[PDB]
């Protein structure tokens, strides 16, 4: 018999199997399509979600009924200290997919990068890249390096640099760096390798990768939740109060004669630690250089992006950061893989210039009232504690 009334199915079948990832960092499944008629550039970065705040922005779109005094929107702060380029790898297009041909690394490698190659650092001999560094300038090793460069320039189509973060610049307790491959999109393979060679051991800032008011894609791992039932995992309807043996379950898990439970039925299991990609995430503030603060042209009081009392569970942001509109997957301290838009948005709101009128920096705990700690003391006056 047919179901009496029709309704959309609960949950998406585009996200099955529903299994938690193992690594915290999420690798981008794809990079923006290469164009061979432009200067070489990097198409991605790596940041840490400091937290969220809210801003007021002036609306520049025309023919809109939005208030002329600004609109309150949420933003997400992603701290992005400069990354260090440790090497690059060439890829070749084979009949089985991209195949890495060779990888060329720099002479000097930081200990944060080396920690990635062990599972117990303090019990290790800590001799990663030791032979590579020791005989870097040997004539036999120099010729091998030059051949590796020549081989990539002849039998490769994709060039990616190996860049890692400097964990000493973030309040994270972790010391082992996070390594990402950032693809180079630009001219021929000859001038792409030349670009990567010049990038060895140099520091790349987030302003060199992303522009102003640029919609980007963010890849990260969602906040974990553990074992969960079908009400939270999928969103099925709760059963009546009269129900024997429980309310928060799917009543019928299949018909008699497909003879088995289907993959499409809602079941209890892990929800949480999933990798998700979101596209068309507009950058509100490129927090580099003169924009590293939280002051605006309308609100000219000098203040950093860190809220009063610090970011909850995170700390203080003192490096370059991204002000991404809205929400991104994952809790604070989670590594976020930024990436240029795979499909550049062409709507009027995507090209709209962003002009912020106010950036909230009050405490994120409780019902705060003051934007700075100096204005709190000024309004409260001398307290008996100090007085």
């Amino acid at each position: 018999s047919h179901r009496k009334f029709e309704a959309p199915r609960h949950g998406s079948l585009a996200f099955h199997p529903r299994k938690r990832v193992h690594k915290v960092r999420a690798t981008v499944s794809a990079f923006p399509k290469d164009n061979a008629a432009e200067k070489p550039h990097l198409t991605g970065f790596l940041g840490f979600k400091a937290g969220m705040t809210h801003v007021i922005r002036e609306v520049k779109r025309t023919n809109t009924k939005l208030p002329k005094d600004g609109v309150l929107e949420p933003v997400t702060i992603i701290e992005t200290p400069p990354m260090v380029v440790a090497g690059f790898v060439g890829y070749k297009k084979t009949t089985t997919g991209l195949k890495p041909i060779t990888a060329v690394f720099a002479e000097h490698i930081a200990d944060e990068f080396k920690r990635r190659y062990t599972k117990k650092w303090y019990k290790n001999t800590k001799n990663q890249f030791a032979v590579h560094t020791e005989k870097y300038n040997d004539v036999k090793a120099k010729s091998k390096r030059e051949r590796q460069i020549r081989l990539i320039k002849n039998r490769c189509d994709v060039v990616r640099v190996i860049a890692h973060t400097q964990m000493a610049l973030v309040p994270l307790k972790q010391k082992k760096a996070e390594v990402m491959e950032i693809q180079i999109n630009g001219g021929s393979i000859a001038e792409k390798v030349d670009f990567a060679v010049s990038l060895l051991e140099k520091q790349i800032s987030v302003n060199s990768v992303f522009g102003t008011d640029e919609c980007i894609d963010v890849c990260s791992v969602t906040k974990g939740h553990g074992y969960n039932g079908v009400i939270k995992r999928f969103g099925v309807r709760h059963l009546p109060r009269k129900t024997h043996r429980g309310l928060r379950k799917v009543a019928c898990v299949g018909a008699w004669h497909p003879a088995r439970v289907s993959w499409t039925v809602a079941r209890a299991g892990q929800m949480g630690f999933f990798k998700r990609t979101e596209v068309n995430k507009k950058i509100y503030r490129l927090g580099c250089g003169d924009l590293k603060n939280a002051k605006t042209e309308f609100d000219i009081t000098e203040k950093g992006i860190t809220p009063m009392g610090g970011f909850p569970h995170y700390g203080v942001v003192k490096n370059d950061f991204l002000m991404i509109k809205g929400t991104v997957a994952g809790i604070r301290r989670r590594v976020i893989s930024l990436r240029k838009a795979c499909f550049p948005s062409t709507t009027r709101t995507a090209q709209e210039q962003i002009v912020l009128k106010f950036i909230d920096t009050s405490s994120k705990y409780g019902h705060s009232r003051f934007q700075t700690t100096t204005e709190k003391k000024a309004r409260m006056g001398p307290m008996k504690k100090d007085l």
Partner: protein
């Protein structure tokens, strides 16, 4: 904006506004001030409000 009960300076995009049938609208900094107003509590008798601190000293 200034809170109706406490008299504090309401930070932007914070608090709630209450509109009455006598064409009068009030804004409050939090729920704590809103309930005290709804109970007809006199802000002059509540110590932490800015109205009280202005009356004496």
């Amino acid at each position: 904006q200034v809170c109706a009960f406490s008299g504090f300076k309401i930070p932007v995009a914070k608090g709630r506004k209450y509109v009455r049938l006598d064409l009068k609208s009030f804004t409050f900094i939090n729920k704590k001030s809103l309930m005290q107003f709804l109970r007809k509590t006199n802000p002059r008798k509540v110590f932490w409000t800015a109205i009280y601190r202005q009356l004496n000293k």
